[PDB]
Write a protein that binds this ligand. Sequence first.
Ligand code: EAH
Ligand code: GSH
Length: 154
Amino acid sequence: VTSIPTGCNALSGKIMSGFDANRFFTGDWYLTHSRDSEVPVRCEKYQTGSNLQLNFNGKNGDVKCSGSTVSGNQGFYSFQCTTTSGGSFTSYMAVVETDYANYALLYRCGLYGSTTPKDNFLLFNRQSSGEIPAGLSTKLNQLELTSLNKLGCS
Ligand SMILES: CCCCC/C=C\C\C=C/C=C/C=C/C[C@@H](O)CCCC(=O)O
Ligand SMILES: N[C@@H](CCC(=O)N[C@@H](CS)C(=O)NCC(=O)O)C(=O)O
């Protein structure tokens, strides 16, 4: 697979310049807000390791993922994930904006077995108590993300 799924937004011209994977894929990231949200809301902690490995506490069990760059779409990563219940899936993401030490705004998209993509904008924070940073105000306006839903972290 050399490009993101048809229907997924490549966000051309809307992604930060100079993204540094070495600084982003380190430590823990809490998923604190999102454009679209489920009920009940939860607090997912994404743990990162070397070579684009990650672990998080998903809807029904731990999820382990392995990432790789997407050759045809600058900034995008493909993650192959497995769940403790025995399931597997693929998901795509790009970092739209981040300061690495506090927050990160991501886009995520996948087909998940369908022909219709399901996507989202995600706000990650280094602290579970993190909320919406002042530095993203204009970017959120531009992307029409004026009302991010707060999830289950505090
Ligand atoms: C610290 C970087 C974390 C970003 C990793 C991105 C993708 C791989 C990890 C998890 C993917 C989970 C996808 C589940 C989606 C589905 O339940 C909700 C669809 C809308 C959405 O993307 O939120
Ligand atoms: N809807 C399809 C696909 C479901 C699917 O792939 N779900 C993935 C992505 S939402 C999953 O299990 N994620 C676990 C998690 O996000 O914690 C099915 O029921 O087989």
